[PDB]
Protein backbone atom coordinates (compact mmCIF):
# COMPACT_ATOMS: atom_id res chain seq x y z
CA UNK A 1 0.00 0.00 0.00
CA UNK A 2 2.92 2.32 -0.75
CA UNK A 3 2.65 5.58 -2.69
CA UNK A 4 4.04 9.06 -3.15
CA UNK A 5 2.08 11.51 -1.10
CA UNK A 6 2.94 14.53 -3.12
CA UNK A 7 0.41 17.33 -3.29
CA UNK A 8 -1.37 16.31 -6.53
CA UNK A 9 0.23 19.01 -8.63
CA UNK A 10 3.90 18.00 -8.48
CA UNK A 11 3.13 14.64 -10.11
CA UNK A 12 5.99 14.72 -12.57
CA UNK A 13 9.15 14.62 -10.47
CA UNK A 14 11.51 11.77 -10.09
CA UNK A 15 11.22 11.06 -6.36
CA UNK A 16 14.95 11.61 -5.79
CA UNK A 17 14.73 14.79 -7.89
CA UNK A 18 12.09 16.59 -5.85
CA UNK A 19 13.55 15.39 -2.56
CA UNK A 20 16.79 17.06 -3.61
CA UNK A 21 14.83 20.25 -4.23
CA UNK A 22 13.42 19.94 -0.72
CA UNK A 23 16.97 19.68 0.62
CA UNK A 24 17.82 22.73 -1.50
CA UNK A 25 15.50 24.90 0.57
CA UNK A 26 16.46 22.91 3.67
CA UNK A 27 20.13 23.84 3.45
CA UNK A 28 19.47 27.53 2.88
CA UNK A 29 19.52 29.18 6.31
CA UNK A 30 17.86 32.41 5.17
CA UNK A 31 14.98 30.66 3.43
CA UNK A 32 11.79 31.94 5.02
CA UNK A 33 8.16 31.31 4.10
CA UNK A 34 5.25 33.71 4.30
CA UNK A 35 2.92 30.76 4.83
CA UNK A 36 4.84 29.62 7.87
CA UNK A 37 3.73 31.03 11.20
CA UNK A 38 4.41 28.70 14.10
CA UNK A 39 7.25 26.68 12.57
CA UNK A 40 7.52 23.77 14.95
CA UNK A 41 10.85 21.93 15.04
CA UNK A 42 9.48 18.52 15.96
CA UNK A 43 10.96 16.12 18.48
CA UNK A 44 8.46 13.25 18.42
CA UNK A 45 4.80 13.39 19.43
CA UNK A 46 3.60 10.28 21.22
CA UNK A 47 6.79 9.69 23.13
CA UNK A 48 9.81 11.22 24.86
CA UNK A 49 12.18 9.25 22.64
CA UNK A 50 10.20 6.27 21.45
CA UNK A 51 6.68 6.28 20.11
CA UNK A 52 4.70 6.93 16.96
CA UNK A 53 5.93 10.05 15.18
CA UNK A 54 9.27 11.81 14.67
CA UNK A 55 9.24 15.23 13.02
CA UNK A 56 12.27 17.38 12.16
CA UNK A 57 12.60 20.90 10.90
CA UNK A 58 15.74 22.33 9.29
CA UNK A 59 18.28 23.19 11.98
CA UNK A 60 19.44 25.78 9.44
CA UNK A 61 16.31 27.83 8.68
CA UNK A 62 13.87 25.91 10.88
CA UNK A 63 11.19 26.02 8.24
CA UNK A 64 12.03 23.23 5.77
CA UNK A 65 10.73 20.29 7.76
CA UNK A 66 10.02 16.56 7.60
CA UNK A 67 7.35 14.56 9.42
CA UNK A 68 8.30 10.95 10.01
CA UNK A 69 5.94 8.33 11.44
CA UNK A 70 5.95 4.62 12.24
CA UNK A 71 6.57 2.51 15.34
CA UNK A 72 9.69 3.91 16.90
CA UNK A 73 11.88 2.95 19.80
CA UNK A 74 14.89 4.88 21.10
CA UNK A 75 17.57 2.51 22.37
CA UNK A 76 19.10 4.61 25.20
CA UNK A 77 19.23 1.85 27.77
CA UNK A 78 18.93 -0.69 24.98
CA UNK A 79 21.48 -2.83 23.10
CA UNK A 80 22.74 -0.51 20.23
CA UNK A 81 22.68 2.32 22.80
CA UNK A 82 21.40 5.81 22.02
CA UNK A 83 20.10 4.71 18.66
CA UNK A 84 16.82 4.48 16.72
CA UNK A 85 14.84 1.54 15.38
CA UNK A 86 11.26 0.38 15.08
CA UNK A 87 8.81 0.75 12.24
CA UNK A 88 8.43 3.24 9.46
CA UNK A 89 5.67 3.69 6.91
CA UNK A 90 5.26 7.31 6.04
CA UNK A 91 7.44 10.37 5.60
CA UNK A 92 6.21 13.87 4.86
CA UNK A 93 8.29 16.75 3.52
CA UNK A 94 7.17 20.35 3.53
CA UNK A 95 7.85 23.91 4.65
CA UNK A 96 6.97 24.75 8.24
CA UNK A 97 5.46 22.42 10.80
CA UNK A 98 2.66 23.41 13.07
CA UNK A 99 0.62 21.94 15.86
CA UNK A 100 2.77 20.22 18.45
CA UNK A 101 0.51 21.01 21.37
CA UNK A 102 -2.57 18.85 21.44
CA UNK A 103 -2.21 17.75 17.85
CA UNK A 104 0.63 16.00 16.01
CA UNK A 105 3.01 17.92 13.78
CA UNK A 106 1.79 18.73 10.32
CA UNK A 107 3.16 20.85 7.53
CA UNK A 108 1.67 24.29 7.06
CA UNK A 109 2.64 24.07 3.39
CA UNK A 110 2.19 20.31 2.83
CA UNK A 111 4.41 19.15 -0.02
CA UNK A 112 5.56 15.70 -1.15
CA UNK A 113 5.26 12.92 1.37
CA UNK A 114 5.69 9.18 1.61
CA UNK A 115 3.46 6.36 2.77
CA UNK A 116 3.27 2.60 2.62
CA UNK A 117 6.97 1.86 3.12
CA UNK A 118 6.21 -0.74 5.80
CA UNK A 119 9.86 -0.89 6.85
CA UNK A 120 10.53 -2.01 10.41
CA UNK A 121 14.05 -2.45 11.77
CA UNK A 122 15.04 -4.98 14.43
CA UNK A 123 16.40 -4.15 17.89
CA UNK A 124 20.10 -4.24 17.04
CA UNK A 125 19.52 -2.25 13.86
CA UNK A 126 21.27 0.71 15.41
CA UNK A 127 22.59 3.27 12.92
CA UNK A 128 22.47 0.68 10.15
CA UNK A 129 18.74 0.22 10.49
CA UNK A 130 17.21 2.07 7.55
CA UNK A 131 14.69 3.85 9.80
CA UNK A 132 17.57 5.37 11.78
CA UNK A 133 19.31 6.15 8.51
CA UNK A 134 16.46 7.85 6.72
CA UNK A 135 15.49 9.98 9.72
CA UNK A 136 18.99 11.31 10.43
CA UNK A 137 19.46 11.67 6.71
CA UNK A 138 16.28 13.73 6.44
CA UNK A 139 17.33 15.72 9.52
CA UNK A 140 20.59 16.61 7.80
CA UNK A 141 18.96 17.26 4.43
CA UNK A 142 19.97 13.94 2.90
CA UNK A 143 17.67 11.75 0.84
CA UNK A 144 20.37 9.29 -0.19
CA UNK A 145 19.21 6.84 2.44
CA UNK A 146 15.51 7.33 1.81
CA UNK A 147 15.98 6.68 -1.91
CA UNK A 148 17.40 3.27 -1.06
CA UNK A 149 14.53 2.51 1.32
CA UNK A 150 12.05 3.66 -1.33
CA UNK A 151 13.70 1.22 -3.75
CA UNK A 152 12.28 -1.47 -1.48
CA UNK A 153 8.77 -1.17 -2.85
CA UNK A 154 9.68 0.20 -6.28
CA UNK A 155 12.14 -2.61 -7.04
CA UNK A 156 9.31 -5.09 -6.51
CA UNK A 157 7.58 -3.53 -9.51
CA UNK A 158 10.91 -2.66 -11.14
CA UNK A 159 11.11 1.08 -10.41
CA UNK A 160 13.44 3.18 -8.26
CA UNK A 161 13.73 6.51 -6.42
CA UNK A 162 14.22 8.01 -9.90
CA UNK A 163 10.67 7.06 -10.81
CA UNK A 164 8.18 9.85 -11.44
CA UNK A 165 5.55 10.98 -8.87
CA UNK A 166 3.07 9.75 -11.46
CA UNK A 167 4.67 6.38 -12.24
CA UNK A 168 5.44 5.49 -8.60
CA UNK A 169 1.91 6.30 -7.50
CA UNK A 170 0.52 4.48 -10.54
CA UNK A 171 2.71 1.42 -9.98
CA UNK A 172 1.81 1.29 -6.32
CA UNK A 173 -1.76 1.77 -7.41
CA UNK A 174 -1.67 -1.39 -9.42
CA UNK A 175 1.21 -1.11 -11.83
CA UNK A 176 0.89 0.60 -15.16
CA UNK A 177 4.30 -0.12 -16.65
CA UNK A 178 2.91 -2.25 -19.47
Swiss-Prot record:
<keyword id="KW-0408">Iron</keyword>
<dbReference type="InterPro" id="IPR010495">
    <property type="entry name" value="HasA_haem-bd"/>
</dbReference>
<dbReference type="InterPro" id="IPR036912">
    <property type="entry name" value="HasA_haem-bd_sf"/>
</dbReference>
<dbReference type="GO" id="GO:0046872">
    <property type="term" value="F:metal ion binding"/>
</dbReference>
<dbReference type="Pfam" id="PF06438">
    <property type="entry name" value="HasA"/>
</dbReference>
<keyword id="KW-0964">Secreted</keyword>
<feature type="binding site" description="axial binding residue">
    <location>
        <position position="74"/>
    </location>
    <ligand>
        <name>heme</name>
    </ligand>
</feature>
<feature type="binding site" description="axial binding residue">
    <location>
        <position position="31"/>
    </location>
    <ligand>
        <name>heme</name>
    </ligand>
</feature>
<keyword id="KW-0349">Heme</keyword>
<dbReference type="GO" id="GO:0005576">
    <property type="term" value="C:extracellular region"/>
</dbReference>
<protein>
    <recommendedName>
        <fullName>Hemophore HasA</fullName>
    </recommendedName>
</protein>
<comment type="function">
    <text>Can bind free heme and also acquire it from hemoglobin. Conveys heme from hemoglobin to the HasR receptor which releases it into the bacterium. HasR alone can take up heme but the synergy between HasA and HasR increases heme uptake 100-fold.</text>
</comment>
<keyword id="KW-0479">Metal-binding</keyword>
<comment type="subunit">
    <text>Monomer.</text>
</comment>
